[PDB]
Structure formats: C-alpha cells, structure tokens
Amino acid sequence: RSLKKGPFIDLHLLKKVEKAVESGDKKPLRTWSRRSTIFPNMIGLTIAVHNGRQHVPVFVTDEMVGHKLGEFAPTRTYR
Amino acid sequence: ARIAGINIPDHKHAVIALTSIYGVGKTRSKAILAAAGIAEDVKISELSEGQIDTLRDEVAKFVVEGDLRREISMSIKRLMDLGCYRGLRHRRGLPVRGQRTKTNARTRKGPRKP
Amino acid sequence: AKLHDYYKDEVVKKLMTEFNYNSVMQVPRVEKITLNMGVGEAIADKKLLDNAAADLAAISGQKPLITKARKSVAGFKIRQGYPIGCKVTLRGERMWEFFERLITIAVPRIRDFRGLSAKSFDGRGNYSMGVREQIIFPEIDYDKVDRVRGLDITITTTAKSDEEGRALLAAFDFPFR
RNA sequence: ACGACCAGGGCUACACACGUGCUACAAUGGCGCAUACAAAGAGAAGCGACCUCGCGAGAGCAAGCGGACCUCAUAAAGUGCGUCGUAGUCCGGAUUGGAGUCUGCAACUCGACUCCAUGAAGUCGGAAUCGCUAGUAAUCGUGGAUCAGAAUGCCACGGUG
RNA sequence: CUCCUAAAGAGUAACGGAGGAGCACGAAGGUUGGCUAAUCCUGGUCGGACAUCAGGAGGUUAGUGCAAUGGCAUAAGCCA
Numbered sequence: 001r002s003l004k005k006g007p008f009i010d011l012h013l014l015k016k017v018e019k020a021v022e023s024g025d026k027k028p029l030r031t032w033s034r035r036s037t038i039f040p041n042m043i044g045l046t047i048a049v050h051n052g053r054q055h056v057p058v059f060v061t062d063e064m065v066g067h068k069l070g071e072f073a074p075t076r077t078y079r
Numbered sequence: 080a081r082i083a084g085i086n087i088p089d090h091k092h093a094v095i096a097l098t099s100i101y102g103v104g105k106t107r108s109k110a111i112l113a114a115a116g117i118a119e120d121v122k123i124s125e126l127s128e129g130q131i132d133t134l135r136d137e138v139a140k141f142v143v144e145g146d147l148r149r150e151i152s153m154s155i156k157r158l159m160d161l162g163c164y165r166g167l168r169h170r171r172g173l174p175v176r177g178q179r180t181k182t183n184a185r186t187r188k189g190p191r192k193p
Numbered sequence: 194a195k196l197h198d199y200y201k202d203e204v205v206k207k208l209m210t211e212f213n214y215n216s217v218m219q220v221p222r223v224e225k226i227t228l229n230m231g232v233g234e235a236i237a238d239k240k241l242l243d244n245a246a247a248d249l250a251a252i253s254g255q256k257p258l259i260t261k262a263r264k265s266v267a268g269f270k271i272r273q274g275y276p277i278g279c280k281v282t283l284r285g286e287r288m289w290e291f292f293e294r295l296i297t298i299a300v301p302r303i304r305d306f307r308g309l310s311a312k313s314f315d316g317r318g319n320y321s322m323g324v325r326e327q328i329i330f331p332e333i334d335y336d337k338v339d340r341v342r343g344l345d346i347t348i349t350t351t352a353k354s355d356e357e358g359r360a361l362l363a364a365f366d367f368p369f370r
Numbered sequence: 371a372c373g374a375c376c377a378g379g380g381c382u383a384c385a386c387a388c389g390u391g392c393u394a395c396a397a398u399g400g401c402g403c404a405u406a407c408a409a410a411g412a413g414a415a416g417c418g419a420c421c422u423c424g425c426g427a428g429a430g431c432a433a434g435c436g437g438a439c440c441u442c443a444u445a446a447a448g449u450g451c452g453u454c455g456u457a458g459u460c461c462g463g464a465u466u467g468g469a470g471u472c473u474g475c476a477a478c479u480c481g482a483c484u485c486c487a488u489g490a491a492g493u494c495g496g497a498a499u500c501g502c503u504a505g506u507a508a509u510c511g512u513g514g515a516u517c518a519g520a521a522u523g524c525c526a527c528g529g530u531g
Numbered sequence: 532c533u534c535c536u537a538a539a540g541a542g543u544a545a546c547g548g549a550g551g552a553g554c555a556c557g558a559a560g561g562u563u564g565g566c567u568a569a570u571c572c573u574g575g576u577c578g579g580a581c582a583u584c585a586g587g588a589g590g591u592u593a594g595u596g597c598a599a600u601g602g603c604a605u606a607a608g609c610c611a
Binding site: 033 | 377378379380382383384470471472475476477478479481
C-alpha cells in the first residue's frame with residue numbers, strides 16, 4: 001500500500017544482502033528492519049528478523065517476494 | 080436463462096439479474112450490458128437468444144465463476160502455507176485487517192462460546 | 194443409434210489394432226447403463242419418492258424400479274423392506290440414444306465443468322460417476338423442481354481391465370481430466 | 371541506576387463479561403436523473419480555485435487569499451420524474467481476495483481513503499432500563515480543536531420539526 | 532419340547548449340565564412357474580463404519596414365524 005514509486009528497504013540490510021550474495025552462502029542475517037521489503041535477490045538467504053526479543057530465522061523463498069520482513073516474525077505470544 | 084456462468088439468473092431487470100453471477104457486481108453488470116448493447120431496465124425475458132449469446136460472449140472476458148472461487152482459494156491457501164501474519168490470522172479464524180479482537184470479532188469468530 | 198452405428202464401424206478397427214486383437218469379439222462392448230437414485234430420506238414421507246422417480250422416468254423414458262432395503266440397519270434407522278430408492282437399467286438402443294444424450298448434452302451443462310476422472314474405474318473395466326444435479330437434463334424443466342437430488346451413473350462394459358475400459362470410452366470422446 | 375541514549379516490540383493481544391456509541395433490519399424506504407433553501411468556522415512549512423490526466427482515492431500545472439474580497443465549499447434531509455413491489459430483496463453492509471492513492475525516514479505487527487469482487491448477522495430485540503416539556507425530542511447535513519496522516523468520539527452550527 | 536450325561540439299536544437316574552413351550556398363520560396353507568445366500572473388496576451425488584447402484588471375490592459361513600437338534604440346492608430358503 002506504499003505508493004508505486006518504488007518499494008522500501010533499509011540501506012544497511014541492502015548492503016548486507018549484496019555482501020552475502022556476492023560472497024556465497026553465509027550465516028543467517030541478523031536484522032531489526034522488519035519494515036524492509038523482500039527483494040528477489042534475497043531468495044535463498046535466511047534472514048533472522050527481530051520480533052521484539054529474539055531474531056526469528058526466516059528462510060526466504062520466491063513466494064515471499066513483495067512481503068515485509070516482519071510478516072514472518074510474530075510479535076505476540078498466544079496459546 | 081443460463082449463462083457461461085452456469086448459474087441461472089432470475090427473470091428481472093438485466094442489470095440486477097446479471098449480479099447473480101459470482102464475480103459480477105453492479106458495476107460489472109452495467110459494463111456488460113453497455114458493451115453488449117442491451118438496456119439495463121429490460122427483463123431477462125423479452126431478450127432474444129441471440130442477445131443472451133451476446134451476454135455470454137461478454138461475460139466470458141471476466142474470471143467470474145468457480146474459476147474465481149478457485150483463484151481466491153489459491154490465494155488464501157498461499158497465505159496459509161506461507162505462514163505469514165495474514166496466513167496465521169486465516170488459520171485461526173481471526174480478523175485479518177487489523178480489527179480489534181478484544182471485542183467485536185463476531186464475523187470471523189462466529190457465535191460466542193463460554 | 195448414432196454412436197451405436199459409430200461403434201461398429203469406427204471404434205472397433207482402431208481398437209482392434211490398438212490392442213492387436215485376434216478376433217473382433219475381443220473388443221469391449223457396452224452392455225447396460227443403470228441409473229441409481231438413492232433417496233434415503235423417503236422414510237419421512239413417500240410422496241417425494243414417487244415424484245423423485247418421476248424425474249428418473251423422464252431422464253430415460255423407462256418406468257423406474259423401486260429398490261427395497263436388503264436388511265435393516267439402524268445407523269440410518271430403516272427396517273428391511275422399506276422403499277429406499279429407485280433405479281433404471283438401460284440396454285440396447287435406448288441405452289445408446291441416452292448414451293449420446295449425456296456425452297453431447299449431459300457433459301456441456303454441469304456447473305463448473307472440469308472434466309471426468311480417469312481413476313473412477315472398478316478395477317476390471319467398468320466406469321461409474323455421479324451427477325449432483327438433476328436440472329442438467331433438457332427433459333426435467335427448472336420450473337418444476339421440488340428438490341435438487343442427484344443420481345449415480347455406472348457403465349457396464351465387457352472390458353477385462355481398466356486400460357481396455359478407458360480406451361473404449363475415450364473412443365467415444367469422453368472428458369478425461 | 372528506580373537516572374540517561376538507542377533499535378525493535380508492546381500499549382492494537384482475545385475463551386469471555388460490561389458501559390457508551392455508529393450502522394441497520396427497510397416502501398414515511400433503496401437506487402438513478404434533474405433541481406431548491408443554511409448557519410457557524412478555519413487558513414501561510416497553510417487553505418489551495420481554474421484547466422489537464424485518472425473510474426475513483428488523487429496527480430500535474432498554477433491564480434487568489436493573513437482573507438465580509440480568495441479557498442476549504444457541491445449542504446443534506448426536501449422537491450419533480452422513473453424504477454424496485456415485500457423477497458434476507460435493487461434492504462443491510464460485516465468479512466474476505468485482488469489492484470491502488472496519499473501522508474510519513476517507514477503503513478508487517480498497526481493508518482486513512484479509492485476501485486473491482488464477495489455479500490455475515492440482522493425481518494424491531496427477554497428480564498430490565500435511558501433521554502426528553504418546544505424550536506425541545508426525533509431526524510438531516512456543516513465546521514473546528516488535537517493533528518504529517520489517523521473521528522462512528524468531543525466541542526460547536528444551522529435545516530425540517 | 533431340544534441337546535448332553537446315555538456306555539456307536541431302543542430305553543436309562545440324581546435338588547446332574549444347558550435352553551425353550553402354554554403360540555402364530557386364510558397365508559406364513561395348496562399348486563404351477565421362476566429364483567439362490569452371508570460376508571468382504573473395488574468404483575460411485577448428497578451418503579457417513581453401516582442405506583440404494585455396479586463389478587469381483589466367496590460358496591451357504593445365509594435363510595427357516597420361535598429353543599435346540601436333525602435336516603434342507605430337486606431346495607424344506609426367496610418371488611409371482
């Protein structure tokens with residue numbers, strides 16, 4: 001629901017992703033930017049998204065492109 | 080009569096009778112009747128079969144029928160299998176679009192149970 | 194006898210070489226089409242079963258045969274011998290004149306058509322499929338409809354396996370999803 | 371450190387109970403076209419016309435206005451004609467899917483709005499209980515504060531009555 | 532009344548071991564014609580472990596107005 005003038009992604013996460021894909025398979029990416037959009041060059045990486053207390057590991061697939069990172073890290077515990 | 084949308088619309092004003100199709104509202108019904116050439120205030124009776132074939136030819140342009148149900152089921156299933164926030168809200172029958180769950184979630188939660 | 198004539202001239206010699214049969218008698222045939230209508234709820238009232246069989250009488254032009262319960266089972270709370278459903282078996286050209294009446298009229302009518310299944314075979318070369326709606330036939334008018342009861346249709350063939358079975362109806366251009 | 375800085379999360383949870391409201395269940399009405407009559411307000415990191423593009427939210431360009439001057443800003447119930455004809459309906463709009471707009475570093479948790487599609491409950495509400503004595507109740511729109519954005523709340527204004 | 536005790540003809544006792552009867556039916560009788568189960572598997576609208584349909588397996592494991600025993604396909608079983 002952001003305008004159609006381009007998606008948003010935090011710059012530090014962008015540079016982390018480029019350094020991760022250019023250097024081959026790496027460790028999970030620890031990030032707090034739940035608001036960043038999942039881009040096609042992130043397919044294959046597992047980003048550890050902060051959820052408030054932990055960094056939830058999220059293995060990115062082609063079906064996730066377009067979502068925000070926080071959509072795969074629930075912040076509230078309910079049983 | 081019957082349409083490429085299997086469903087059988089009632090014999091009443093064409094603009095409202097075409098709404099019985101799943102996927103055709105008022106705007107799309109008016110657009111179908113305009114692109115076909117039929118008035119909106121004429122009943123489904125008094126319509127020639129050549130005119131109903133015309134309406135079928137126009138409704139064939141839209142994905143409006145069990146096909147649309149299939150595309151909606153596919154999207155909800157993709158959400159649920161992805162495990163995203165909306166997927167979890169769909170799994171538990173809770174409101175998906177940010178509505179409050181403290182009170183007033185009766186459409187998604189159904190009749191209340193103690 | 195449209196497909197009946199179409200049977201003895203066209204689908205025999207393509208099948209005769211498709212399976213390399215020695216005699217023409219080895220090709221599968223179509224003995225009978227039997228339409229079953231399991232009412233089940235007629236125990237509440239039997240006025241609805243006669244008109245239910247009145248529909249099946251209009252689909253095939255034959256007076257139906259009211260089936261009775263073979264044994265009491267309480268799981269559906271019936272006594273043995275209760276009128277539980279009607280059926281009609283079709284043989285000869287009345288089977289054929291009906292066999293084209295659905296494959297060319299019964300196929301292009303079902304709501305949200307997706308095609309028939311290729312797995313619904315008995316295992317020895319006999320096909321069976323169920324239609325959910327009765328207003329799919331030209332005979333039964335939409336105006337006169339007290340209920341939306343369906344019915345089962347099974348195809349009895351002299352085929353020995355499902356491969357020979359599916360090959361026969363495929364020759365009649367059967368929708369196979 | 372019970373002080374201070376930061377990022378993310380929460381205050382928005384959800385078996386359930388209550389208070390206060392909004393929208394309805396329709397024909398004294400819904401929809402379509404045409405047309406009539408207000409008051410009170412706000413505006414400079416603001417109100418923003420006209421014109422062009424967009425189905426629309428809006429966008430581009432760009433006057434005027436620190437304002438009895440310009441803008442917000444088309445009042446709506448009403449009235450005329452047509453249609454619907456008592457049905458879960460051309461009532462009702464919940465919910466959900468898809469596509470977008472704008473603000474904002476940033477709309478995932480958790481914004482408002484638009485378009486297409488879908489069309490829950492609801493057919494007047496048990497025990498009980500509330501407000502109101504006249505331009506009042508009832509009903510219909512309008513504006514402002516807070517405010518980047520976010521009113522069914524609050525505070526005010528007039529129409530019918 | 533039926534079975535066992537009862538000792539391969541009959542019969543055979545106990546406060547021995549187990550069960551039933553004190554009816555039903557004008558068809559559930561007569562005759563002629565026809566028919567052949569139980570159960571399970573597979574496929575099939577609602578339909579489900581279990582309804583009706585189709586096929587295969589199976590071969591009487593079913594049925595017999597009612598206890599048990601002996602019978603029953605030429606059916607004594609089922610239908611007209």
